[PDB]
Amino acid sequence: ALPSIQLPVDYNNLFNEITDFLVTFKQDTLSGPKYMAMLQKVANRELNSVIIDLDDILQYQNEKFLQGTQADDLVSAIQQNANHFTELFCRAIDNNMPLPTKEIDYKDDVLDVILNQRRLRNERMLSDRELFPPNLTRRYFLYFKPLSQNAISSKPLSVRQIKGDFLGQLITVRGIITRVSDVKPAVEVIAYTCDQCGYEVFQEVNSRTFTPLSECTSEECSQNQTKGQLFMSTRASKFSAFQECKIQELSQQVPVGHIPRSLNIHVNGTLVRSLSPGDIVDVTGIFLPAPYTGFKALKAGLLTETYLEAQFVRQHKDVEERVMELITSGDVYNRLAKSIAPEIYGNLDVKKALLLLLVGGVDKRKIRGDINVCLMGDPGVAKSQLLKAICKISPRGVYTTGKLTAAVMKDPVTDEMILEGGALVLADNGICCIDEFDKMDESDRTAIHEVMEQQTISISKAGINTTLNARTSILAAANPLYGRYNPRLSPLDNINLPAALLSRFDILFLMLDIPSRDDDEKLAEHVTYVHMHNKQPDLDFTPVEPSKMREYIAYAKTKRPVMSEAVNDYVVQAYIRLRQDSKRFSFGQATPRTLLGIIRLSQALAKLRLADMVDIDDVEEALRLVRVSKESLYQ
Amino acid sequence: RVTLQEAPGTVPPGRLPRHREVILLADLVDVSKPGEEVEVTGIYKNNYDGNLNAKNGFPVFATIIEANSIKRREGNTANEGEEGLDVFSWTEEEERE
Amino acid sequence: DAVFGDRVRRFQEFLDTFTSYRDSVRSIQVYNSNNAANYNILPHRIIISLDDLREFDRSFWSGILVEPAYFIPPAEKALTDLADSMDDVPHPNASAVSSRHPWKLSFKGSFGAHALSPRTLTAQHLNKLVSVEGIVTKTSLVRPKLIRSVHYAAKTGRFHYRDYTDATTTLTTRIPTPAIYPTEDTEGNKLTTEYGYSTFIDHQRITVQEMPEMAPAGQLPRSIDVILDDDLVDKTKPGDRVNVVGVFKSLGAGGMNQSNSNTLIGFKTLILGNTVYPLHARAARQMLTDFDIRNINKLSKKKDIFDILSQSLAPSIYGHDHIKKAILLMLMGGVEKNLENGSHLRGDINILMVGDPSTAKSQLLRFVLNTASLAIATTGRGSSGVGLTAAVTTDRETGERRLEAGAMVLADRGVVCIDEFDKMTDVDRVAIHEVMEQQTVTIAKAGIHTTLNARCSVIAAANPVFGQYDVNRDPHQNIALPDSLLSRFDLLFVVTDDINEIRDRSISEHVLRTHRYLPPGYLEGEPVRPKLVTIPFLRKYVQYAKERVIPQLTQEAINVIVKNYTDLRNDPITARTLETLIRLATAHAKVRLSKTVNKVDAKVAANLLRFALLGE
Amino acid sequence: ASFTCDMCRAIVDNVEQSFKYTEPTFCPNPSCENRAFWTLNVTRSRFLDWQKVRIQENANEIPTGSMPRTLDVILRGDSVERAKPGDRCKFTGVEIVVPDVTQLGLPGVKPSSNSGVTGLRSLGVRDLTYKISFLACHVISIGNERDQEVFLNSLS
DNA sequence: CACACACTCTCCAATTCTCTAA
DNA sequence: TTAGAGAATTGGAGAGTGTGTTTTTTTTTTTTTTTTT
Ligand SMILES: Nc1ncnc2c1ncn2[C@@H]1O[C@H](COP(=O)(O)OP(=O)(O)NP(=O)(O)O)[C@@H](O)[C@H]1O
Ligand SMILES: [Mg+2]
């Protein structure tokens, strides 16, 4: 029924060690007491959570052992049963917290009034010719931060390594955050007002559910045998921010033939919204059973479900000068292009085109400034790795296979609807990298058109009559039917994209896996090195770092260059000849889309050289990307 | 029990067929096969049940035909000369004929 | 009280006599004291020989087998009281002192009539210690089960405790404790629950199914549910062939409760598992002796080995030496490179045999399926794209959304044998691309969003679209598949049954010798119930060549590989085909038991690929 | 409704019915301590005819082509079957509130599972919640008798 | 199982009714 | 006629008894019909 046992712990000792630690401890070895100074920030309301570094308590115990006084192994208590010590540290803090030194503007808070009226009522009663639960007045959240390696809270666990033997302990868990709740208020202390006796009473909640009070029990209500009625008041309740998250083990950790298991993480208080889905993270936390309550507790039996209370969070992963440190090296255009995907060797004009997606043309009023590029031709050319490199390099980039539109989605996961924003809405004011572009449904394919023509997508279901703004540059790639491209034939013959779509790109670029003894040796020597030496081979130039490349581009974009008179004079002198030669064999004719294209391309080159406007030494290169693309369609 | 539905040649087109629960007791069980046009004589009855009163929100009673005989609507049916529960039965004065 | 306390001293005298059990207890205790306290941890479990116990006291041994709920408890108490006499440690921690962590028994050998399977296990076996043999399915998720709660009585300083009882925790029946914590003391003090001083044990439920090979005519496989706990948890995964020892036991009221009116339903029945032994022979790996190692090493020196070992694959199948060579290299698969920037390179050789009917395509898939350490059979019509990848389910123990593994996930680090591969539906073939490219499957259904490992080598068989290979038509006319999927295979062998008087005589004599086989010890007409190696040795050779050798690619082989790649490409060959040459060369270097890929390995890789391309 | 007391065999009659089925709270015989255990007399009790018809806002009226909003209309007596699906009708009658009767403690049924109103003897701790419905007294549609002896009397 | 709600049973004392003397 | 003591009936405390509660519901295969393939 209820026997009792001699455990080698005494919480009266350890409460004395904890209060003795808090008042005494200073990290003066960094050359007043650390936690006293911290508590002053709490008392002045400049701070809302107290982080206790377990690595400090070692230095406390080390100093006390060096003084020859045997501190009572406190870290080995609070790793081994962390939950109870959240109560002891809050008691030790409250007993020691200093009076405020800055003005609070006290009477803006409700509890300062309620508890004062409760104080005065007790004096005016008790003249006669705890006071309330302390959790109600704790304006701060306590968290432990675990040991760094210098011990079980140090070693990060995969989710399957967390056996039932770990329950109650402080642990560290490694994984991806797979999903996250919206933040909701949990109650901690519920305040009620009695209608008749005019007296406040508090219920404290420590479970997934609770039962409300309804009938008054204040001294002056029960003494007057008045059946007072209690009503809940949210204004005087204490809530905490609660957010539930799910963590999954990493693909490296799963043993051969198993499935990636998961834990529920509960994050409470100031630590909330520190987790985002797809983070790889180490969460340290207190591992616990969530006990079923009410009828389910009987039938569920001894089989407790479980969760982790978050305590601290470790993510796994000068600007204004660094752009000059690029510029003052010179030849920025060719070096930035050669620095797109440096692992792919050759194909320079493609890299020199793709760079102009990142930078883009200019919008006007509306008229599109965004640039559309379609890569084309043989498989094994690594177009997917190049699209992937642009997805990592580009600001606001999104990779998405055909293997896409926004739509109403009814009961995803929780039993509620959402208007889901497709990849073309994820790519707002950025690059949409659509790989396997021809493996697409007509309902998505014809929704590419409205992103071109209207800079938007439209919805027409469940009464949702909405348009979503969706300005984005499209990078596309496609692969040929019959396994290899036929040089006897057009792109229109090898690929199912119609000219009414295919001719909407500012650049279409045919790139091919052409066999040739030297070119095949140059490729095969690179591949056979990467099987001997696990890092990339010697580039024989130094590339721009992607972070410094992004930092350049964000600054280069906003300069929005304007026309100079010789540009508009010159561009017609090319365009007319391009029309005249298109008069004279596929579909590659000089549409006005190609005039607009040369404009947007020349704008993207003008941005890269950082000026208010630029001379036609620029424009002549934009014409070369187009001219080389057409010669690449023929060969 | 037999769920009995309206005959699709009497159901007005584009409007739903109605049904009733029919109950067959001793010696009437196994008399009709799913998909026959059947003619029932019986007692139309009703009883309380809470599921109606719950979902419909009014004091409304379910209804049941306790069957007392069954006939199968074979022959030409627009015919007064063909009495009885079985139009292909003969009498002794008919077998002799 | 009385008989329990005697059976305790009766088992204590066994542990004193067979001193190897004290030595095993000592070995566990010092190893845990080293790795936990002085510096990955061993369970408090001892496997006793049931044959030592038979010879010490036949009346205790027959008690353990026929009345285990009365003889295993005092035997585990005797073993626990032994380990506490041996245990010494200065200043033990509160969780150790509070642990409720006694010693558990496990058993070896000689079960006799108590050796069973899911079909022969019968109500006459209830409450007996049984060994059951089967294939694992439906492993449920691990949950911690509460077995002791510790409480602290503030205003007194006493730690209280409560123990908990459930019909799957104990061998004997006890009044079931209701899973509710003490909130208030006997005196009326408030109680706080001490997690970490409290005790929980891991718990898992597994379904063990009859091996389909043993199922009687026209009957489908039976199954039993087995309960596993503490350190037996996750010692199994679905598709494991296994032998489980445990007490077969009944549960519940079985409709004897006036809450039910049916009177035809029966009691629930389970095995409480005491031990688990994995198998793979039709024993999950071969343990290798110093003699096995001597033979494997000495045999690897003979220049003919690539012929000796590949001819010892499927010796009943005549011809196809070049396909059987490719199968040997698929079994001794190449090395995987986990390169940075996500650049993971596959080690796994994929083989497609497309060809005329009756050429041993299916009888070489059924050979791979037998000789490989992990192999999963599938067929094109029998496979859904769901059952290849992973299927959504509810775990009936916990009421929760879960994935079951499909054939491509169960085959992780093994082989998938896909027969009838061209009969797969287009929607099911989508699932094969992901595994062959990315060695993984991606799930996005039911509010499960995940990536599963599927690091398996596909061997597949097909026929051309016209039932025999039409030599007057192109490969892309003859072969039904997208050329994208055909590029994910390393070796696309095309095979024909072509008439030739000497070959037809040669294969005809060979199958007539093959049908004349008489298995040793059978009678004439009784119904069944210069160098080659035996298949159990070939299985050891393959296992050694995967656990001991990881060849490094070397300049001698590079000078050959790029010479032969550039020759092939300058007169379907693509960038992927260079990586096939490196896989075949890395695989052959393992057959030679060598740490470096030499010029010989690169030449054999190029000849074997050139055979598959040109039909040399 | 009309009921007979199983305890004393008395009869109660003219028992008006709200949205829930309702037996008498007290026996009419002053010898009888009964407050329950009633049986219906199906001969003496009287039944209206009733029909629910579900109607929606007209497909030409919906202001922007949004979702069509619906209403439950109740027809009684002669007004039943006077409409048909896909038809266009004008109904006149009262707008009514219908209680969610399972929460109102209906004889022999479980409550179901937005916030209602509470604090009533018949609810105890439960909430009562409300649908809007219409109770139509008159119905008109806005959307072969081949004998001259009927047709020439049918015309004016 | 066990813990709230729904509902009946029973006892006890609180209030009002009724009679008597101040 | 007021006012105070003794007798009867009603209110409601509170003890006792009895009932219901977990809860899900997509997913994956197999089929049979329309039509848009
Ligand atoms: N080379 C051979 N040597 C010995 N037996 C052979 C040989 N080729 C085929 N057989 C036998 O022929 C039968 C059919 O072999 P099987 O593997 O089922 O044919 P398959 O090539 O897969 N033909 P199919 O199923 O029609 O596509 C089996 O009994 C084989 O053992
Ligand atoms: Mg076959």
Ligand SMILES: [Zn+2]
């Ligand atoms: Zn009150």
Ligand SMILES: [Zn+2]
């Ligand atoms: Zn009565």
